[PDB]
């Protein structure tokens, strides 16, 4: 009887399906920084605020990095393979992951720009950190972003929507919809899309990007 | 060893086979890519008749290119091409010599015919004209658009003088910025420089 009961446990159907009344529309996340809320404060780190000067942006860029690294956390941004849609022979993704505001990465090619993040081993991402500069890079500012998820390039699937209006700072996105029990994302394949820029732009930069995961002597 | 004229020998290639053989911006690049693939395919798939034919030097690729219906040296000048019947060909083989064992050796590592390998290894011409959309555009709001006007002008110092509206702006290519020179009540129509960029001769709308 042990075989029969475990089979029910692996695949509960009558217990699981409540009404099967899903709305099936894609949920959209609001990123605006003019409204103060507890949920927004959790995802927006730098704080709600004329347009600051670029050096002020560089200063807040470092303070955002320090605050994100201040908490107990493990950075594995360099523990994965990256393959953007196309280069421009001026700046590879290294200057995007160099944690420097002055340097940045630029793609050049088709309008739906793609950024690939491949992982070697099953890593459980909890917080994804991305930095935007609306006033500094208004021409190449990312306006709409769609984040995918999957275990392979084969099974990439939609996760979340992100609309950009005015965000001149680091953006933190912890994942809770997928798994409420773990409060983290478990995947080996993450890809990002930038289908259109602000004011009908063509290309897109990426100032910063980071990935966050949880975990006498003789010299 | 030489076939008679009145009684020619028949090659294995058939009437319609020659009908097959003789059949023929990124668009130019793709068309060139398609043609070499087609020529290579018909060269490799055929050529057993061509290998049995020929008398000396030359190549099966040259025979196919000669069929009517940076360049390297052509070997021989024969343009016989495909043919149903051959007169000169009577079955004969040269004795094996050290060059032949050298040749059969460089062939041992080749999955295709040496002639096809030479055709592929030959470099295609990289001769194209690129006149496409501009690679850089800067800012110059409110530019004059009168038929009797000629505003922009090159200078040897990577310096451009523009009459934007009623003020003269300076664009430096080495810096990529805009510098304002002066302005007046009447709009400018013509711009010029005297010497080596030392002076700027500008014409107004009233002479």
């Amino acid at each position: 009887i042990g075989i029969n009961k475990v089979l029910d446990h692996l695949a509960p159907s009558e217990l699981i399906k409540p009404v099967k009344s899903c709305h099936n529309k894609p949920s959209v996340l609001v990123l605006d920084d003019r409204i103060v809320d507890a949920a927004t404060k959790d995802l927006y780190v730098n704080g709600f605020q004329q347009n600051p000067t670029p050096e002020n942006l560089q200063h807040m860029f470092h303070q955002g990095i320090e605050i994100l690294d201040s908490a107990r956390m493990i950075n594995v941004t360099h523990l994965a393979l990256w393959k953007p849609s196309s280069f421009k022979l001026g700046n590879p993704v290294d200057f995007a992951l160099d944690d420097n505001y002055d340097t940045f990465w630029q793609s050049d090619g088709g309008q739906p720009h793609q950024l690939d993040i491949m992982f070697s081993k099953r890593m459980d991402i909890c917080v994804m950190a991305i930095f935007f500069s609306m006033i500094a890079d208004e021409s190449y500012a990312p306006s709409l972003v769609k984040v995918y998820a999957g275990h392979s390039p084969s099974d990439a699937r939609f996760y979340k929507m992100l609309e950009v209006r005015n965000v001149n700072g680091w953006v933190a996105l912890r994942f809770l919809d997928n798994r409420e029990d773990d409060q983290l994302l478990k995947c080996q394949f993450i890809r990002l899309l930038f289908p259109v820029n602000h004011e009908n732009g063509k290309d897109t930069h990426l100032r910063g990007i980071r990935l966050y995961v949880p975990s006498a002597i003789l010299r | 060893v030489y076939g008679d004229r009145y009684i020619p020998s028949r090659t294995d290639i058939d009437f319609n086979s020659i009908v097959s053989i003789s059949s023929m911006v990124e668009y130019q690049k793709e068309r060139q890519a398609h043609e070499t693939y087609n020529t290579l395919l018909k060269n490799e798939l055929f050529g057993e008749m061509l290998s049995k034919d020929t008398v000396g030097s030359e190549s099966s690729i040259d025979r196919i290119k000669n069929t009517r219906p940076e360049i390297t040296r052509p070997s021989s000048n024969s343009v016989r091409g495909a043919s149903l019947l051959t007169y000169q060909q009577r079955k004969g083989r040269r004795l094996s010599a050290a060059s032949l064992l050298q040749s059969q050796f460089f062939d041992s590592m080749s999955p295709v015919r040496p002639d096809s390998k030479q055709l592929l290894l030959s470099p295609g011409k990289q001769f194209r004209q690129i006149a496409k959309v501009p690679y850089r555009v800067l800012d110059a709001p409110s530019l004059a658009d009168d038929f009797y006007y000629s505003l922009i002008d090159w200078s040897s110092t990577d310096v451009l003088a523009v009459a934007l509206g009623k003020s003269i702006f300076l664009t430096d290519n080495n810096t990529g910025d805009v510098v304002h020179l002066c302005d007046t009540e009447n709009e400018y129509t013509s711009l010029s420089w005297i010497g080596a960029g030392s002076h700027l001769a500008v014409g107004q709308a009233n002479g």
């Binding site: 820029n197 004011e199 009908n200 063509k202 | 800067l138």
Partner: peptide, 6 residues
């Protein structure tokens, strides 16, 4: 500025 719109 580039990024010229149609």
């Amino acid at each position: 500025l580039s990024d010229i719109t149609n």
